[PDB]
Short mmCIF file of C-alpha atoms in Angstrom, two decimals:
data_model
loop_
_atom_site.label_atom_id
_atom_site.label_comp_id
_atom_site.label_asym_id
_atom_site.label_seq_id
_atom_site.Cartn_x
_atom_site.Cartn_y
_atom_site.Cartn_z
CA UNK K 1 -79.49 51.99 7.05
CA UNK K 2 -78.98 49.36 5.10
CA UNK K 3 -76.44 45.85 6.58
CA UNK K 4 -75.95 42.15 6.22
CA UNK K 5 -77.04 41.73 1.99
CA UNK K 6 -77.65 38.57 0.58
CA UNK K 7 -78.61 37.72 -2.93
CA UNK K 8 -80.61 34.36 -4.22
CA UNK K 9 -80.29 34.04 -8.09
CA UNK K 10 -82.90 31.15 -9.13
CA UNK K 11 -82.41 30.64 -12.80
CA UNK K 12 -83.70 28.14 -15.02
CA UNK K 13 -79.96 27.57 -16.86
CA UNK K 14 -77.28 25.58 -16.23
CA UNK K 15 -74.68 28.27 -14.53
CA UNK K 16 -71.31 26.51 -14.30
CA UNK K 17 -68.38 27.88 -11.95
CA UNK K 18 -67.21 30.59 -13.87
CA UNK K 19 -70.77 32.35 -14.69
CA UNK K 20 -71.27 32.22 -10.85
CA UNK K 21 -67.65 34.06 -9.77
CA UNK K 22 -68.71 36.56 -11.92
CA UNK K 23 -71.93 36.90 -10.80
CA UNK K 24 -70.83 36.97 -6.81
CA UNK K 25 -68.08 40.28 -8.10
CA UNK K 26 -71.21 41.68 -10.02
CA UNK K 27 -73.42 41.46 -7.17
CA UNK K 28 -71.08 42.64 -4.18
CA UNK K 29 -69.97 45.75 -6.61
CA UNK K 30 -73.05 46.67 -6.86
CA UNK K 31 -74.34 46.29 -3.05
CA UNK K 32 -70.76 48.25 -2.08
CA UNK K 33 -71.73 50.71 -4.44
CA UNK K 34 -75.73 51.04 -4.41
CA UNK K 35 -76.16 50.16 -0.79
CA UNK K 36 -74.87 52.00 1.04
CA UNK K 37 -70.72 50.51 2.71
CA UNK K 38 -67.45 50.10 0.79
CA UNK K 39 -66.04 46.50 3.56
CA UNK K 40 -69.36 45.41 3.33
CA UNK K 41 -69.72 41.77 3.10
CA UNK K 42 -72.02 40.08 0.77
CA UNK K 43 -73.45 36.54 0.61
CA UNK K 44 -74.76 35.63 -2.34
CA UNK K 45 -76.59 31.61 -2.96
CA UNK K 46 -76.98 30.02 -6.86
CA UNK K 47 -80.05 27.91 -7.40
CA UNK K 48 -79.67 27.14 -10.98
CA UNK K 49 -81.61 24.30 -12.98
CA UNK K 50 -85.00 25.74 -10.91
CA UNK K 51 -87.48 25.58 -13.48
CA UNK K 52 -89.16 29.05 -13.85
CA UNK K 53 -92.83 29.80 -15.69
CA UNK K 54 -93.90 32.99 -17.08
CA UNK K 55 -95.95 34.54 -19.56
CA UNK K 56 -96.52 30.80 -21.03
CA UNK K 57 -93.06 30.16 -21.75
CA UNK K 58 -90.52 28.15 -19.58
CA UNK K 59 -88.05 29.76 -21.80
CA UNK K 60 -84.56 31.18 -19.33
CA UNK K 61 -85.99 33.56 -16.89
CA UNK K 62 -84.90 34.39 -13.24
CA UNK K 63 -85.26 35.70 -9.89
CA UNK K 64 -84.07 37.04 -7.24
CA UNK K 65 -84.36 37.97 -4.14
CA UNK K 66 -82.05 40.79 -1.90
CA UNK K 67 -82.66 40.87 1.68
CA UNK K 68 -80.71 42.99 4.26
CA UNK K 69 -80.88 43.67 7.83
CA UNK K 70 -82.56 47.12 8.43
CA UNK K 71 -85.46 49.12 5.59
CA UNK K 72 -83.91 50.44 2.28
CA UNK K 73 -83.70 53.74 1.16
CA UNK K 74 -85.89 54.55 -1.71
CA UNK K 75 -83.35 55.67 -4.27
CA UNK K 76 -81.12 52.63 -3.61
CA UNK K 77 -83.36 49.24 -5.06
CA UNK K 78 -84.02 51.49 -7.98
CA UNK K 79 -80.58 52.10 -8.69
CA UNK K 80 -79.55 48.75 -8.09
CA UNK K 81 -82.08 46.12 -10.13
CA UNK K 82 -80.88 47.56 -13.48
CA UNK K 83 -77.75 46.83 -12.45
CA UNK K 84 -78.31 43.13 -11.46
CA UNK K 85 -80.70 42.15 -14.30
CA UNK K 86 -78.03 43.45 -16.56
CA UNK K 87 -75.39 40.83 -14.55
CA UNK K 88 -77.72 38.41 -14.93
CA UNK K 89 -78.05 39.16 -19.15
CA UNK K 90 -74.43 38.94 -19.33
CA UNK K 91 -73.81 35.89 -17.56
CA UNK K 92 -77.09 34.23 -18.21
CA UNK K 93 -78.14 36.01 -21.73
CA UNK K 94 -81.75 36.02 -20.03
CA UNK K 95 -83.04 38.99 -21.41
CA UNK K 96 -83.93 41.80 -19.04
CA UNK K 97 -88.23 41.59 -19.74
CA UNK K 98 -87.89 37.14 -17.91
CA UNK K 99 -85.86 38.49 -15.06
CA UNK K 100 -87.69 39.64 -12.03
CA UNK K 101 -85.37 40.95 -8.69
CA UNK K 102 -87.08 41.12 -4.91
CA UNK K 103 -86.23 43.29 -2.08
CA UNK K 104 -87.07 42.66 1.80
CA UNK K 105 -85.15 43.34 4.56
CA UNK K 106 -85.82 42.18 8.57
CA UNK K 107 -85.15 44.17 11.99
CA UNK K 108 -84.19 39.99 12.84
CA UNK K 109 -81.16 38.57 11.35
CA UNK K 110 -77.97 37.32 12.22
CA UNK K 111 -74.12 36.47 12.28
CA UNK K 112 -71.61 34.26 13.37
CA UNK K 113 -73.86 33.13 15.50
CA UNK K 114 -75.24 36.22 17.17
CA UNK K 115 -78.22 38.52 15.59
CA UNK K 116 -77.41 42.45 14.57
CA UNK E 1 -103.09 47.18 -4.75
CA UNK E 2 -101.38 43.72 -5.47
CA UNK E 3 -99.21 43.31 -8.90
CA UNK E 4 -96.14 41.29 -10.02
CA UNK E 5 -97.01 38.24 -8.53
CA UNK E 6 -94.38 35.46 -8.22
CA UNK E 7 -94.57 32.03 -6.47
CA UNK E 8 -92.06 29.75 -5.36
CA UNK E 9 -93.25 26.12 -4.85
CA UNK E 10 -90.88 23.46 -2.67
CA UNK E 11 -91.62 20.29 -2.97
CA UNK E 12 -90.29 17.04 -2.20
CA UNK E 13 -91.92 15.10 -4.67
CA UNK E 14 -89.98 14.77 -8.26
CA UNK E 15 -92.37 17.09 -10.54
CA UNK E 16 -92.14 16.49 -14.15
CA UNK E 17 -92.70 18.69 -17.29
CA UNK E 18 -96.71 17.87 -17.62
CA UNK E 19 -97.22 18.80 -13.72
CA UNK E 20 -94.85 22.43 -13.71
CA UNK E 21 -97.06 23.06 -16.89
CA UNK E 22 -100.30 22.36 -15.06
CA UNK E 23 -99.29 23.93 -11.61
CA UNK E 24 -98.42 27.03 -13.21
CA UNK E 25 -102.08 26.99 -15.53
CA UNK E 26 -103.43 27.20 -11.89
CA UNK E 27 -101.61 29.45 -9.76
CA UNK E 28 -102.51 31.67 -12.90
CA UNK E 29 -105.78 30.82 -12.82
CA UNK E 30 -105.69 31.61 -9.24
CA UNK E 31 -103.65 34.82 -9.86
CA UNK E 32 -105.80 36.43 -11.64
CA UNK E 33 -109.27 35.73 -10.28
CA UNK E 34 -108.33 36.17 -6.61
CA UNK E 35 -105.15 38.72 -6.65
CA UNK E 36 -106.60 41.44 -9.39
CA UNK E 37 -106.31 42.03 -12.77
CA UNK E 38 -106.64 39.80 -16.08
CA UNK E 39 -104.67 40.42 -18.30
CA UNK E 40 -101.59 40.17 -15.18
CA UNK E 41 -98.61 37.93 -15.42
CA UNK E 42 -97.23 35.84 -13.10
CA UNK E 43 -93.73 34.14 -12.00
CA UNK E 44 -93.92 30.22 -11.07
CA UNK E 45 -90.45 28.73 -10.16
CA UNK E 46 -90.06 25.08 -9.29
CA UNK E 47 -88.20 23.67 -6.84
CA UNK E 48 -88.95 20.13 -6.71
CA UNK E 49 -86.81 16.95 -4.62
CA UNK E 50 -86.36 19.32 -2.17
CA UNK E 51 -86.71 16.85 1.04
CA UNK E 52 -89.38 18.99 3.26
CA UNK E 53 -89.67 17.73 7.32
CA UNK E 54 -93.05 18.22 9.09
CA UNK E 55 -94.69 16.63 11.99
CA UNK E 56 -91.93 14.16 12.30
CA UNK E 57 -92.64 12.53 8.83
CA UNK E 58 -90.46 13.14 5.55
CA UNK E 59 -93.35 12.15 3.86
CA UNK E 60 -93.99 14.43 0.73
CA UNK E 61 -94.91 18.20 1.68
CA UNK E 62 -95.03 21.06 -0.31
CA UNK E 63 -94.32 25.47 1.01
CA UNK E 64 -95.01 28.04 -1.58
CA UNK E 65 -93.63 31.48 -1.02
CA UNK E 66 -96.37 33.69 -2.84
CA UNK E 67 -94.81 37.72 -3.25
CA UNK E 68 -96.00 40.57 -5.20
CA UNK E 69 -95.72 44.47 -5.24
CA UNK E 70 -97.72 46.53 -2.48
CA UNK E 71 -99.28 44.87 -0.21
CA UNK E 72 -102.09 42.18 0.20
CA UNK E 73 -106.17 43.13 0.35
CA UNK E 74 -107.07 40.91 3.56
CA UNK E 75 -109.49 38.91 1.94
CA UNK E 76 -107.65 38.05 -0.97
CA UNK E 77 -104.84 35.18 0.46
CA UNK E 78 -107.52 33.47 2.03
CA UNK E 79 -109.48 32.43 -0.55
CA UNK E 80 -105.73 31.41 -2.95
CA UNK E 81 -104.58 28.98 0.22
CA UNK E 82 -107.30 26.24 -0.74
CA UNK E 83 -106.49 26.67 -4.77
CA UNK E 84 -102.84 26.55 -4.39
CA UNK E 85 -103.82 23.64 -1.96
CA UNK E 86 -105.79 21.92 -4.04
CA UNK E 87 -104.02 22.03 -7.19
CA UNK E 88 -101.13 20.93 -5.67
CA UNK E 89 -102.82 18.05 -3.91
CA UNK E 90 -104.67 17.25 -7.55
CA UNK E 91 -100.98 17.47 -9.46
CA UNK E 92 -98.80 16.22 -6.60
CA UNK E 93 -100.74 13.36 -4.37
CA UNK E 94 -99.21 16.12 -1.57
CA UNK E 95 -102.83 16.24 1.96
CA UNK E 96 -103.69 19.46 2.91
CA UNK E 97 -102.62 19.02 6.22
CA UNK E 98 -98.71 18.67 4.61
CA UNK E 99 -99.27 21.94 2.99
CA UNK E 100 -97.95 25.50 4.09
CA UNK E 101 -98.68 28.47 2.40
CA UNK E 102 -97.27 31.81 3.12
CA UNK E 103 -97.28 35.51 1.47
CA UNK E 104 -95.10 38.33 1.33
CA UNK E 105 -95.06 41.79 -0.12
CA UNK E 106 -92.96 44.55 -1.01
CA UNK E 107 -92.39 48.28 -1.63
CA UNK E 108 -89.03 47.53 -3.86
CA UNK E 109 -89.49 45.24 -6.41
CA UNK E 110 -88.09 45.06 -10.71
CA UNK E 111 -89.13 44.15 -14.02
CA UNK E 112 -87.82 44.42 -17.13
CA UNK E 113 -84.42 46.27 -15.48
CA UNK E 114 -87.03 48.76 -13.85
CA UNK E 115 -88.64 49.15 -10.18
CA UNK E 116 -92.23 49.16 -9.84
CA UNK V 1 -97.24 35.53 19.38
CA UNK V 2 -95.22 34.13 16.54
CA UNK V 3 -97.08 30.18 14.67
CA UNK V 4 -96.51 28.29 12.43
CA UNK V 5 -93.06 27.80 11.69
CA UNK V 6 -91.12 27.32 8.34
CA UNK V 7 -87.05 27.13 7.88
CA UNK V 8 -85.45 26.70 4.99
CA UNK V 9 -81.61 26.03 4.93
CA UNK V 10 -79.72 26.52 1.67
CA UNK V 11 -76.32 25.04 2.42
CA UNK V 12 -74.02 24.72 -0.41
CA UNK V 13 -72.17 21.53 1.20
CA UNK V 14 -74.62 17.83 0.55
CA UNK V 15 -76.73 16.54 3.31
CA UNK V 16 -77.73 13.09 3.90
CA UNK V 17 -80.62 11.70 5.30
CA UNK V 18 -79.28 11.56 8.66
CA UNK V 19 -77.71 14.68 8.75
CA UNK V 20 -81.12 16.83 7.74
CA UNK V 21 -82.60 14.20 10.81
CA UNK V 22 -80.52 15.77 13.37
CA UNK V 23 -80.82 19.16 12.00
CA UNK V 24 -84.84 18.87 11.69
CA UNK V 25 -84.88 17.56 15.15
CA UNK V 26 -82.91 20.16 16.61
CA UNK V 27 -84.95 23.33 14.91
CA UNK V 28 -88.36 21.65 16.53
CA UNK V 29 -86.77 22.02 20.03
CA UNK V 30 -84.97 26.02 19.19
CA UNK V 31 -88.65 26.18 18.28
CA UNK V 32 -90.38 25.42 20.63
CA UNK V 33 -88.17 26.31 23.83
CA UNK V 34 -87.52 29.24 22.26
CA UNK V 35 -90.63 30.85 19.86
CA UNK V 36 -93.25 30.01 22.28
CA UNK V 37 -95.19 26.34 22.46
CA UNK V 38 -94.17 23.21 23.16
CA UNK V 39 -96.93 20.99 21.20
CA UNK V 40 -96.31 23.42 18.12
CA UNK V 41 -95.25 21.72 14.59
CA UNK V 42 -92.10 22.88 12.43
CA UNK V 43 -91.87 22.97 8.72
CA UNK V 44 -88.10 22.43 7.64
CA UNK V 45 -86.76 22.58 4.29
CA UNK V 46 -83.74 21.39 3.14
CA UNK V 47 -81.90 22.82 -0.18
CA UNK V 48 -78.42 21.62 -0.24
CA UNK V 49 -75.13 21.02 -2.30
CA UNK V 50 -76.58 25.00 -3.51
CA UNK V 51 -73.64 27.09 -3.69
CA UNK V 52 -73.34 29.78 -1.40
CA UNK V 53 -70.01 32.69 -2.01
CA UNK V 54 -68.95 34.84 0.47
CA UNK V 55 -66.07 36.84 1.44
CA UNK V 56 -64.83 36.30 -1.72
CA UNK V 57 -64.80 32.76 -0.82
CA UNK V 58 -67.27 29.32 -2.19
CA UNK V 59 -66.36 27.70 1.16
CA UNK V 60 -68.59 25.59 2.60
CA UNK V 61 -71.76 28.65 3.88
CA UNK V 62 -74.84 28.09 4.92
CA UNK V 63 -78.49 30.59 4.84
CA UNK V 64 -81.34 30.21 6.98
CA UNK V 65 -84.97 31.93 6.36
CA UNK V 66 -86.60 31.62 9.36
CA UNK V 67 -90.86 32.61 8.84
CA UNK V 68 -94.04 32.31 10.77
CA UNK V 69 -97.24 34.16 11.27
CA UNK V 70 -97.48 37.48 13.27
CA UNK V 71 -94.42 38.87 14.52
CA UNK V 72 -91.91 38.19 17.20
CA UNK V 73 -90.98 39.07 20.06
CA UNK V 74 -87.49 40.71 20.30
CA UNK V 75 -85.80 38.69 22.36
CA UNK V 76 -86.71 35.27 20.81
CA UNK V 77 -84.96 35.48 17.67
CA UNK V 78 -81.29 36.98 19.17
CA UNK V 79 -82.12 33.16 21.80
CA UNK V 80 -83.13 31.31 18.31
CA UNK V 81 -79.44 32.09 16.23
CA UNK V 82 -76.87 30.78 17.98
CA UNK V 83 -78.67 27.38 18.56
CA UNK V 84 -79.87 27.31 14.86
CA UNK V 85 -75.94 28.31 13.89
CA UNK V 86 -74.28 25.55 16.78
CA UNK V 87 -76.58 22.87 15.06
CA UNK V 88 -75.32 23.64 11.19
CA UNK V 89 -71.57 23.92 12.28
CA UNK V 90 -72.17 20.46 14.55
CA UNK V 91 -73.38 18.75 10.95
CA UNK V 92 -71.79 20.44 8.66
CA UNK V 93 -69.17 21.39 9.68
CA UNK V 94 -69.62 24.85 8.80
CA UNK V 95 -67.94 27.81 10.95
CA UNK V 96 -70.42 30.12 12.79
CA UNK V 97 -69.02 33.34 10.97
CA UNK V 98 -70.04 31.92 7.54
CA UNK V 99 -73.80 31.11 8.78
CA UNK V 100 -76.56 34.07 7.68
CA UNK V 101 -80.00 33.32 9.64
CA UNK V 102 -82.60 36.19 9.14
CA UNK V 103 -86.65 36.28 10.30
CA UNK V 104 -89.55 37.36 8.49
CA UNK V 105 -93.18 37.22 9.54
CA UNK V 106 -96.62 37.75 7.65
CA UNK V 107 -100.09 38.11 8.83
CA UNK V 108 -100.52 35.93 5.61
CA UNK V 109 -99.84 32.13 5.62
CA UNK V 110 -102.30 29.14 5.42
CA UNK V 111 -102.32 25.51 6.13
CA UNK V 112 -105.14 22.21 5.53
CA UNK V 113 -106.45 24.41 3.21
CA UNK V 114 -107.28 27.16 5.08
CA UNK V 115 -104.98 30.65 6.33
CA UNK V 116 -104.34 31.29 9.96
#
């Protein structure tokens, strides 16, 4: 079904190494449990200090882009969002009402120099 | 039709708070008038100082990624691009010939910890 | 077929001007030879110093997002990935096993203030 998951987290707050490590840990679990495979591997990029505007405010907000090969079973993104958002709230203090999560997928994506 | 619009603006110039606030204002109008709903809310992320190369030049250029739930009525992106590009030119001095705008959408996207 | 190609390169290492210029040169060739048209033009954005986690490690890794108008002939992404990854390894020392490349496309995308 879904493979090679990549998450980009864009946040207006500053993150440090502990918080990125904690986020990567959380995302990895969420991906393993909700997206499919235990032994899966997950790539996780953090763009912090990125100003974000939302509802007329620049208070801390987040956007996460989830990508993967194939296409999603329609139940899985529903299960993932509240976990992703909870993990962002815990590590970053950003309330869920200022967190956007979008999921995309493709048939074309490549790793170790060879497409899936 | 189209919901929960997110714009990421990637620019090679430096932006300050006034210019991001002006861009967020402009995007909000463009989204409300062209994309659908008045009371809509719009998330707007600014990655400035990001080097961009184009036509063999690294002079100031821009890329904007527009995302939203569902799929676009085919007339709306056509209407949005010239407004987005005009707003970037005004706030950033980037000529329209170095501005790329791409639109994506998904059926899976989530807010306040719950998918749309 | 495929038009207006945009590449975003996200790397956890620092890039300098020579290395971005070399990457933009390489991407341009790869796009011209594999994606379609000689006289094509290619936009290339570099987000360096972006922490990335993968397989439990934050050693240097890369993610590249390739975007373009239309949709891909299914052979072309297969041909592009190993070139993109080779170019990243050469300029950045990142081994191919920590390089992800994803390809997306849209029917809606705009330049010089007018959609394709």
